[PDB]
Amino acid sequence: VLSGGELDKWEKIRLRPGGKKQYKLKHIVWASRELERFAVNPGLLETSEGCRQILGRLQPSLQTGSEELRSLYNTIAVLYCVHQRIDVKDTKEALDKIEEEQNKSKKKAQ
Amino acid sequence: VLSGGELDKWEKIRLRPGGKKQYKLKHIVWASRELERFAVNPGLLETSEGCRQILGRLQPSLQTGSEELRSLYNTIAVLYCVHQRIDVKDTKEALDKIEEEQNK
Amino acid sequence: VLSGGELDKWEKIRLRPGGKKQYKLKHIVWASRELERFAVNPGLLETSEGCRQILGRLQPSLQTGSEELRSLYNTIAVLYCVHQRIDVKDTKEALDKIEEEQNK
């Protein structure tokens, strides 16, 4: 799911933009169990493309979503960035980078 | 979720047009736990706007929806009308008045 | 859900192509409780038209769906074929005939 190079990066990323706690292995195990509960293939966490497919599957549920659902989305958003060689310090940067790249793909449409 | 003025009208609203059973607090407690079960923030039941968002989230599931889902939609549909200060006698009136606004 | 003539057909269909295990009553019980769990009316399993609506509702979840979700879709696809009196030997033939029927 994460390589050794990906995991040492993962473990430095902060949960909040200026908090002390950082992402850990148990958050990946947690996200993997959450997807099973939602009848989603947890093996999709293994690639950039799988994470991209999951975030698109979950996005329509974000606005009305519980804290559990939003935490799950945020975790997979950070995971997507790690797979993608996108350096992020915190969850918010991961979320910022997904919108500005999803904004770029709109720009690429025309 | 409901103020005292809103809770006062809620308890007079009939489940069926126009049967004996009326909405109570236990219907709100139930709907809130059902939303948690479907990973929906039950805190959206506190406002008119939150209820509209849930109703739009649930709308596409209605045609194939279980009895549990249709009851849940009906309960928050009545809850939306109370928040909007729309007087309704029964669930079916709540469903129509929500439909006439969605048309506009 | 199934008549006796349909149940005689159901119990001959193999889970996997030329495998040994065959569909049984418990797979219908499972699919029905699995649908309630996802807020889908299990009463739609009783007709060809109901199964097609369920399949259409489940379709967008297939690409990211777990093995549990695909297993549910596959069981209802076979049930559709039995209702529609389409002869299938196994789950894959059911899936192929539903795809080729939507192509026409």
Author numbering:
A (entry chain C): 7 to 116
B (entry chain E), C (entry chain A): 7 to 110
What does the paper say about this structure?
During the late phase of HIV-1 infection, viral Gag polyproteins are targeted to the plasma membrane (PM) for assembly. Gag localization at the PM is a prerequisite for the incorporation of the envelope protein (Env) into budding particles. Gag assembly and Env incorporation are mediated by the N-terminal myristoylated matrix (MA) domain of Gag. Pioneering X-ray crystallography studies of HIV-1 unmyristoylated MA [myr(–)MA] revealed that the protein adopts a trimer arrangement.
